[PDB]
Amino acid sequence: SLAKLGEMRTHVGMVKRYWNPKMGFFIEPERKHNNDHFVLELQRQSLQTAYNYVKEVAQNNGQILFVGTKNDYVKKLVNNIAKRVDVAFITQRWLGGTLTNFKTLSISINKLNKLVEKQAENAADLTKKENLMLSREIERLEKFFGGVKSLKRLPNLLIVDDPVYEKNAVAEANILRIPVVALCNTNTNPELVDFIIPANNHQPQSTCLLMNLLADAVAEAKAMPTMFAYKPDEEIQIEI
């Protein structure tokens, strides 16, 4: 169905002693083995609440932001969903400040659109060296700003894979009033996240399921076909 034990092929196993004492109170009364465990039911209800809230937000005709920058796992997932669902995304590392400072984003994306429109219009307007340099700038833009050139305004909603590990993203989100969802870990702060989703992300076998479920949420909300979040089976996605 939706986020039950059958789909959960991994819910614990996060490396120990990287934890937040107040994140030992919201979830999983302390285990004697001290291994980072997570609760099933509370996470399920929190995910359901996030699902319905993002449904309502999308029905309000708002903007959304999705993030992924891990080595290959979360990056691959976010790229698949980006070519599946039109959401704001960054394929590569956060630039330190990319949400709080906003005017610099606007000028960067204006230059990006100038370059894209020049390249599309250009049949013979530059030399080979000039075109190579322009293509180099285009590629550099595709690396970071390329994932957000599609939309030209602030995304009203955003997900975070790990707010403490994405310290820049969580800081810049707390700078603004935008509501934020995050796959909260045992070493995070619930007050930094607007809507708590306590789940293991360092174990990829759970963050892949979470990413798929958010993809289902945004697809169904956008009046688009949906693949999971209501299905008696899910595909195996394990590291090789």
């Binding site: 809230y53 937000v57 309000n60 708002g62 009203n156 509501p179």
Partner: peptide, 5 residues
């Protein structure tokens, strides 16, 4: 808050 408007 659970509304945007």
């Amino acid at each position: 808050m659970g509304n945007f408007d």
